[PDB]
Amino acid sequence: GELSKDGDLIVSMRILGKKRTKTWHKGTLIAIQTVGPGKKYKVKFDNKGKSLLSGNHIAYDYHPPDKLYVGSRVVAKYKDGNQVWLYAGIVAETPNVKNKLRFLIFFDDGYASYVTQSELYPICRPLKKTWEDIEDISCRDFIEEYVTAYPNRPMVLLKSGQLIKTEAEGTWWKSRVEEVDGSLVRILFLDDKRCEWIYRGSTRLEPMFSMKTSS
């Protein structure tokens, strides 16, 4: 079942591939094979290794041109402090005034951040329902609900200095709003002193949880 091409996927192209670590890495597409129900894509990584991958586990090595939309399946730069990885997610918001022309990404592990146009890459063959390859069931469920409800996004209006409870790991914690950036809020957990950027429509934020529990 060997192919030299599949539409715009051509043997020899540059590509990103998902490693068993779930991080993504640069490489070359060296083969295309039909195996049972679909195609598999053989990637030789630049640094080390080879993998045989489904089409939702490869991404183009170019940045999207208004091509992407809410629900788009992407690989993006996941920056948390001074650590950076390429990791899969979903486009939650496209560039606009309120967000200073950035993309909001909801990553497959539950992380959220804004990224620039030059920090994301379109997955080559996403699933029709783009969330159906998210492994973590809580994340998968959340994204299905979010994408389906879009553009109805209930959010809480929060101000710097405001004190609220924020959930983490099953506990509701005293916290403080440090900063607002578009649809994200930087929450300081007051017992720990760590910060987290959280979506203003997340029911981890007390005012958002309370609204939903009553509604």
Partner: peptide
């Protein structure tokens, strides 16, 4: 990695 995800545990 530190994330609490999108919804309460």
């Amino acid at each position: 990695k530190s994330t609490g995800g999108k919804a309460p545990r």
